[PDB]
Design a protein around this ligand. Sequence first.
Ligand code: 7C6
Ligand code: 7C6
Ligand code: 7C6
Ligand code: 7C6
Ligand code: 7C6
Ligand code: NAG
Ligand code: ZN
Ligand code: ZN
Ligand code: ZN
Ligand code: ZN
Ligand code: ZN
Lengths: 338, 343, 338, 338, 343
Amino acid sequence: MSPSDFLDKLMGRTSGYDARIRPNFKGPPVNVTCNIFINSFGSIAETTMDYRVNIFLRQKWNDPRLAYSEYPDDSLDLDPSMLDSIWKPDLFFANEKGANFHEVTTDNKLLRIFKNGNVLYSIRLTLTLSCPMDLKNFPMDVQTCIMQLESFGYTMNDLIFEWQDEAPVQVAEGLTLPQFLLKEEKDLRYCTKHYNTGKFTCIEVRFHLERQMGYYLIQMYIPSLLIVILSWVSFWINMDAAPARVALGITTVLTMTTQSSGSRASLPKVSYVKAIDIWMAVCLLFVFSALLEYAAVNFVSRAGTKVFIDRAKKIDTISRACFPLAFLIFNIFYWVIY
Amino acid sequence: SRSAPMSPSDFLDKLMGRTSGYDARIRPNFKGPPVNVTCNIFINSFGSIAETTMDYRVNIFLRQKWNDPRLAYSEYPDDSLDLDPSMLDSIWKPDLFFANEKGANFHEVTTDNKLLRIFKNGNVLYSIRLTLTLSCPMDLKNFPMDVQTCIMQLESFGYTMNDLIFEWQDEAPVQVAEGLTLPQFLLKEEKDLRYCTKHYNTGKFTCIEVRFHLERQMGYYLIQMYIPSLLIVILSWVSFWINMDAAPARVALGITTVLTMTTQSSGSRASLPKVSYVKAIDIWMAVCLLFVFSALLEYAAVNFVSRAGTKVFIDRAKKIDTISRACFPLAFLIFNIFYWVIY
Amino acid sequence: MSPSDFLDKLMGRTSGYDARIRPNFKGPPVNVTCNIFINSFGSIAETTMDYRVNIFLRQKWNDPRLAYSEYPDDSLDLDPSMLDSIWKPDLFFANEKGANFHEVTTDNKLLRIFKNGNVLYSIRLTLTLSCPMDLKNFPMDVQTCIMQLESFGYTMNDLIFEWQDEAPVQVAEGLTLPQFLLKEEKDLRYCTKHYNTGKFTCIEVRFHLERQMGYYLIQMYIPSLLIVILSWVSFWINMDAAPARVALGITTVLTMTTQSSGSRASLPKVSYVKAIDIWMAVCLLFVFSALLEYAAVNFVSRAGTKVFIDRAKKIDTISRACFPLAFLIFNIFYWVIY
Amino acid sequence: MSPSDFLDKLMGRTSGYDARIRPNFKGPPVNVTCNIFINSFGSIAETTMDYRVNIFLRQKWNDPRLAYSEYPDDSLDLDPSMLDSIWKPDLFFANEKGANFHEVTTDNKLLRIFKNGNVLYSIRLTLTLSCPMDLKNFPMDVQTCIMQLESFGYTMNDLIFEWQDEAPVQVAEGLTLPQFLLKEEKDLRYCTKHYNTGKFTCIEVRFHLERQMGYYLIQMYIPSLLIVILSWVSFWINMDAAPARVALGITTVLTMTTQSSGSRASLPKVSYVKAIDIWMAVCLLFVFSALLEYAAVNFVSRAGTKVFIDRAKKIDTISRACFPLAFLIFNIFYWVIY
Amino acid sequence: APMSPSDFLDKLMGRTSGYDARIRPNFKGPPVNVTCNIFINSFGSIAETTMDYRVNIFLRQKWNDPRLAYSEYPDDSLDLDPSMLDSIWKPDLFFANEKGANFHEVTTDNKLLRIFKNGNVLYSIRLTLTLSCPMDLKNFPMDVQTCIMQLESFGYTMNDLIFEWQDEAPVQVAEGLTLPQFLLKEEKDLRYCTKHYNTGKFTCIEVRFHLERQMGYYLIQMYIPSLLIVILSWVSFWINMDAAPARVALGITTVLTMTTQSSGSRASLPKVSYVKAIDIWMAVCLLFVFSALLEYAAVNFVSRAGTKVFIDRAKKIDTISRACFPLAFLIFNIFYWVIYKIL
Ligand SMILES: C[C@H]1[C@H]2C(=O)N(C)c3ccncc3[C@H]2CN1S(=O)(=O)c1ccc2c(c1)OCO2
Ligand SMILES: C[C@H]1[C@H]2C(=O)N(C)c3ccncc3[C@H]2CN1S(=O)(=O)c1ccc2c(c1)OCO2
Ligand SMILES: C[C@H]1[C@H]2C(=O)N(C)c3ccncc3[C@H]2CN1S(=O)(=O)c1ccc2c(c1)OCO2
Ligand SMILES: C[C@H]1[C@H]2C(=O)N(C)c3ccncc3[C@H]2CN1S(=O)(=O)c1ccc2c(c1)OCO2
Ligand SMILES: C[C@H]1[C@H]2C(=O)N(C)c3ccncc3[C@H]2CN1S(=O)(=O)c1ccc2c(c1)OCO2
Ligand SMILES: *[C@@H]1O[C@H](CO)[C@@H](O)[C@H](O)[C@H]1NC(C)=O
Ligand SMILES: [Zn+2]
Ligand SMILES: [Zn+2]
Ligand SMILES: [Zn+2]
Ligand SMILES: [Zn+2]
Ligand SMILES: [Zn+2]
């Protein structure tokens, strides 16, 4: 039988096929088995609280109307134009903020039918998905970004989604993220929705994204240690040199306030304390105390008498050992906690 | 003799297709009273609240319900039928648009995110997923302790009040997805519903409205704005414990604190529209500018009265600092009592 | 007569209507009467020199072919799908940089026909329109933004536009702009174009936008007075304290240069002097002179002799009264001029 | 003859017209005569190295099939819907980075046919065109931005483009650019392309854009003179005041480094020396030398002896006349060169 | 007389032709061999942050369709109107690493269709593609990147459809095409990327461009203005030791400038969590400036008492540091530049 004629009798003019009617229409729900191949994964944005992904979305279901016997082939690879002629699930991504198909140089779609009327339908999609983030432990945080596959119009009695048993979520080889590590384990679960319009099938995959620490040492943690260590050189400087010790005390405090506000500059304006906020606040005290240390040294040494110049002397020889020690004690706590 | 039921293909053809004689260019009860459309929205997502562009984004399911006697059926016992959304093009449906929408789009991946359900008696349920960007004019007088009312107007474009009328559902008109959070605001449980009925030179058009109340969260602004400003004001005070002879130290300390406080002040408006009125944060930064600027003028006085090295004036200058060490922290504490209690 | 049949005889299959032919085709030009309702007005950008608007564009003309007698109704509200079946003007916005229709949840269009064949056609549009700006007096400037309604293909002998006599441009109640005031008076005029392709109808509406001064006091003028007043505290400071007076003189000059460049930072790079440039330049002199004042005080007082220390003393006691006075004299001039 | 019937017989059902076949199909190439009206000209971006333009693109050619005798009119203004029914050139802009048609409120298109079968076809387009820039002399530079009109599918034997003899490129009256001057002279030339697919017609127009100098005096050149003049006030300051002269020397150098990096901040990261880079580098030396001048004054005056204090004195009295003179000598050279 | 074009197209691929574009050439036979070549019209928007790059190309595909062979004209080939492309079968080539792509439709579809006597097809289409290009920034800004471009079939397995590059001149680049940040190396690697998914084995061919980053900007913007801050730190040693505020201020300002200089060098880059060549330089430049201040901490501390022995002991340090630091920094640059230019 010619392909042209075969398609016409299976789903075309002479077929009597109606794509407005689901498989097993009077019967039980259609079982759609999903699996995704992740071609690309990125644009993870804390500010807009979302992430971008390029996938092949594979759907599999049975349509008895599409079973065939005219060829011995186990399956037939059909031109995707025929996808408009057949029924197919109305899968949408519940947490999608934006999405598009791919049409260059032709519709990036795949349609394969099997002797027994099983269908394989792969489509390439780019999705931007919302990923609400808890930044409590930033930048030693770990985020769980999700992806929900849902039916828009079919209730649970007509259409049901399910993940493949074997290898539901595959990721392209050598796929890397510059800020995060994509953990091998993906959680799969049901998100089944109940609205006033009914109960709708929904299945979910959770990606775990562990943020890489390295950049923040280079950009945030090391250049702050360097400002705290700079505040300590004041104690080896002569007490008579007020402008020098004060200027050194001021500059370190103002650098540490811009350093502090600059650490939140690529983040959403969440109204809770983050792990980086703690560090910058504690680093603000250790620098701000260094100036108050000189306020004390300058004030007790007002009169030039030997008793007070040596009393003021005592403070610096203690502070030279106390602050580096106290800061070392703080880092022991801080890093071990996180 | 219980014969087989009518095929769906044939049934759709007789109800709204070729053989039906249905005309979607004609409303239900066309010569009669207006069509009553009952609306309800499910808020899937709520965000991108922008002070600068004075708007906000939302992803919703917009449910519309009305009666079309033409679509009543008796061929199946089912209370309702879930139809393929392709059939939405074949039937009449309201021309609802969002009056305050700055941008809007449908969702087509992986298919049109639409729902069509018809009932025995010809009632229709029509749900469509939409992303809308809606204008929300903001009063920033009390920023950042402000509370905004963002609205959403559902309106007919072509049907006057005698042909088409909108109305909110009595039970649960506006539902919000579970665990939906906004990082900057709290979305208040109470939503006001009201009529926005428009009169233009083209006629009187139905319009119904929902008002969301968004209370801004204070926390970030303590961390970013209020605490780092207290810290600059407290820094200005360490000048008074410093020896009066050290002019460059006290002056530098006085200058640096004033310039930090001007960049601090301009940086607080940097993510806001250029409104031409005084905000609550402008007050705080202006008062914080005085308490730091006065600290330098305090030393101008100490340096000036102590010109000659005589005991009488060095002690006179001494008097000022021992007063200022207690006065400014006290005066600033008195200001915060007022400021915070007012807002 | 049934509506279905009536539409079919007026503009459909059996009608013989041809939308490729204008009304009164062999006769005089079609008179299109325009009016706009401004739903929204904003995104006024100095940098890109344009502004955004959301309008209902109402067009009215007569089509004798669409006259009817089958119903007593003065007019009929038709489904907008019928707009494709009828002729209608080819109005475009000559100064539009971008524009779009509105399709959610259906085409935001209105079609109303009258017994005598008059048509009312309202369409919702979002337009971004170019508005060239003169920034000479910024930020005490006032801009005139325009909007040109023009025919693309019809010459003046076939199609003519005209504003409504009564209430051509309506604005939504309580519509506010945060940076400007939209003046009640709108100028209407003809922009009739002559190209090598012919003479084409064009009508224009000019909006007057007066910029609100308030922000610029808060952000620009007050924080500059504050830097000029800071430069003056140098004169009450002891002349022996060189580092203090110099540092105070320097910091005020550098703050005043960043203050000056920061005032143009949200503007296009026009190559002419603006009113804010004058103020920042004069404010730069009054601060820069304060440092040159100390250069003089430090230089004439080189030797510690009584004659020169008192000579240097003379300068500051003059400068303490002269600069505040001279600056007050400048503001009298400056503000009264603008 | 009725218009409806006339269009049917000329290009419609009964016409036998086939728009897949060019005019004079077995004969010589079709001569398309182009001319553009520039409605708008802007968004000239150094960073992305391109510019935006809104034009009416007029094309003229002869189609013997479209000649008519049924009306006395020299030409007929047809509804643009008829453009789909007729053959027309496949002109594209070879250097277009993005482009769009205009559809509000209808397709901004014009179709006019003449007795002898000549066609006039005007279409409104917005084009973003690439304009590679030489920034050697920035900001006293002059750029040549081009626009190439090319056929995509027709080789030179089937289709040839050519500019109008009279007035090929017209510009709207009072069209201004805030950063540049658009020079009256436009060069026209042939860009005829040879690819492995064949030899394709291409014609070009070159615009000359001379950058306006004014902004850069206000923003860049004057505020740098002001920092260089500030460095010179150090020489009138007492040599004993080390912190004052040093602070004044430092602040001027750091301001001059941010001033230098801030001058390239709106430019692409080209790897060659620009005219503004020279000026900022020379301005960096004259300020940096002023501090090295004090290093010398402070170092030779170590011991308080009269011989060295006067030796150090000598340097400043020379530097007070030398640097302003040397800088004046530099500007003579610099400005006269450019 | 010859056959009319209208009739000829109708018999070859139109109504009367019986052609079915849903069936590939040699459908029951071996795979279709598609020979690709690209002309690069433009190459740019290379972004480190988003880790991708833009390109405008003519994508030429060549294959044989026996159904399209003709004898009615002597012409070796026929240039057909691209509307006829919808009437014929053609490969489903897509760019595997494309992040975004579009066709060009102004003023008409930028497409080319040419058929030959023997049924060979030439099909050129203009495309703009944004392609992902993962970058290794270890040696930035003396780095060299390899950006790729993968041509792949979406639906045809290797037994039905195979891609292959042209032997002669597969990738042509427009004359005088320049990139402002990089040099595009003449040598392009071609290779096979043949993919195996759970849906099957799909043809894929690849071209690798080599982009060498130009050094010049970074001298002007990054390396020279940092040498200038390190040289500024050295003028402290020629300054009198008694002038504490001057030497300290000079020591501080240089350190803070060098921290903003350091953070500003990463400001146009993605937040990679590894050490780059510019990070090394800024860190070493931070030490040479930070040591200069610690040098004065030592000079100020050993000279506490005004005695001749210690003032001369402190004196010794500066006369060593005046020769040591410029020497030590020169020794560092010898190492640094030779490492990143002798490798
Ligand atoms: C056959 C369809 C649908 C329909 O159009 N009709 C006329 C009937 C008739 C009798 N009983 C049920 C129906 C519905 C349900 N079936 S369906 O299960 O194939 C179907 C088809 C399309 C759907 C849908 C359900 O929900 C979302 O869109
Ligand atoms: C039946 C329609 C509309 C129409 O087309 N015709 C021919 C008539 C005839 C007689 N009387 C009224 C009409 C109008 C009104 N009706 S309608 O109520 O169904 C209708 C239909 C569509 C509409 C509309 C009103 O306003 C918005 O767009
Ligand atoms: C009847 C139309 C137009 C046309 O298409 N034809 C065939 C003829 C035939 C005879 N005489 C004139 C015409 C022209 C002019 N008229 S029209 O005035 O209705 C018209 C119709 C469409 C137009 C237009 C003018 O300007 C551009 O778009
Ligand atoms: C007549 C067309 C084109 C064609 O379709 N056929 C069938 C033939 C037949 C015989 N000889 C030549 C052709 C070609 C050439 N002509 S054409 O010159 O009008 C033409 C038409 C369209 C074209 C084109 C050339 O190149 C670009 O796209
Ligand atoms: C002829 C097509 C396709 C088809 O539609 N039918 C009906 C049959 C019948 C018998 N054997 C195979 C087929 C398949 C395969 N062939 S095809 O090689 O021309 C083809 C055509 C289109 C394709 C495709 C393969 O891969 C996906 O897109
Ligand atoms: C769907 O199919 C899987 C096997 O493919 C089966 O295990 C599962 O139970 C099915 N679910 C339903 C509701 O039929
Ligand atoms: Zn897990
Ligand atoms: Zn309320
Ligand atoms: Zn006026
Ligand atoms: Zn020239
Ligand atoms: Zn190679």
